[PDB]
């Protein structure tokens, strides 16, 4: 089994952290 669990969890976490980070950055950057 290739890491199927990871392929999707990877997409989930990269997207969720990137979105959360984009929110963190905007939340402050908006001033």
């Amino acid at each position: 089994a290739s890491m199927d669990a990871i392929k999707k969890k990877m997409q989930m976490l990269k997207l969720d952290k990137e979105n959360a980070l984009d929110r963190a950055e905007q939340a402050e950057a908006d001033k």
Partner: protein, 54 residues
């Protein structure tokens, strides 16, 4: 003695034929074991080597 020797030669020829078939099947099974093993060990070495960031 000949009929018995022919029985043995033909018995054995029929049996060796079956054994040869067993080898052909066995090797295909072997290849499946090796190929699936190879595919799994390698798909993981590569899946984990590329999928390192999570």
């Amino acid at each position: 003695k000949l009929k018995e020797a022919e029985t043995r030669a033909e018995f054995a020829e029929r049996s060796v034929t079956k054994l040869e078939k067993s080898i052909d099947d066995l090797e295909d099974e072997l290849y499946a074991q090796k190929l699936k093993y190879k595919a799994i060990s390698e798909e993981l070495d590569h899946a984990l080597n590329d999928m390192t960031s999570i």
